Amino acid sequence: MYVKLISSDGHEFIVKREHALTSGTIKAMLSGPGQFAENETNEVNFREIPSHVLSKVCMYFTYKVRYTNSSTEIPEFPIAPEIALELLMAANFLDC
């Protein structure tokens, strides 16, 4: 019910499976010959993604799942100036 994500730097992050399931690419990678064995744990590693961008992605996951179908003014998502360029890259690749 928990999943592990591994960056190219080697940092490992543990996330609730339903939160990580939103992105289509992750779901596609899980559903297949990979991640099909019950004995093996549920982990996914990107040989490409850096650390900070992936961390921003996962806090985006929880922020989105938290303010969903809520009748109110959503808080803005803080984006650093230099981060945005690579964050767009990661969002496009993950198809979130």
């Binding site: 809520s70 009748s71 109110t72 003014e73």
Partner: protein, 157 residues
């Protein structure tokens, strides 16, 4: 006075001519109803627009009944539009008027539109919870056995 009764009848030309004579339209009767109330009952949007053009202000009768609310009661949407557009009001009065309009569409025999009522009430209540963390309160009266359950709704579900 001929002004208020003419507004009730809705003859635009005679009302326009009488107003041309610079007659004060702020006159009152025994009921205390100003010509805006009679125009709202008539529902002539042009008459109300002309009355507003020469500085006719909203005035409340002793027993409530602001002309906007009176127009909303009789299922007269256009007057509600015009008055809300021109006459500045708070959040509470506007939502109250919208809810009254919804109920009037719901129960009366002239229109009897169930969907229009539902959508108007939905819009009003969505406006109630617009801000978030700053919620207009909703007071519910105790149930009446005449209506059965008789409990209002304050959550969108």
């Amino acid at each position: 006075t001929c002004l208020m009764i003419a507004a009730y009848k809705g003859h635009t030309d005679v009302v326009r001519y009488l107003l041309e004579q610079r007659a004060d339209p702020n006159a009152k009767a025994h009921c205390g109803a100003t010509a805006l109330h009679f125009a709202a009952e008539a529902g002539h949007i042009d008459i109300v627009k002309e009355l507003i053009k020469w500085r006719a202000a909203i005035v409340v009768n002793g027993h409530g009944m602001t002309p906007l609310k009176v127009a909303a009661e009789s299922c007269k949407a256009d007057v509600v539009e015009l008055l809300l557009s021109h006459a500045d009001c708070d959040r509470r009065s506007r939502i109250e008027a919208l809810e009254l309009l919804g109920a009037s569409f719901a129960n009366d025999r002239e229109n009897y539109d169930i969907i229009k009522t539902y959508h108007y009430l939905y819009l009003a209540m969505l406006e109630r919870f617009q801000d978030g963390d700053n919620i207009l309160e909703k007071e519910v009266l105790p149930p009446i056995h005449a209506y059965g359950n008789r409990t209002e709704c304050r959550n969108p579900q």
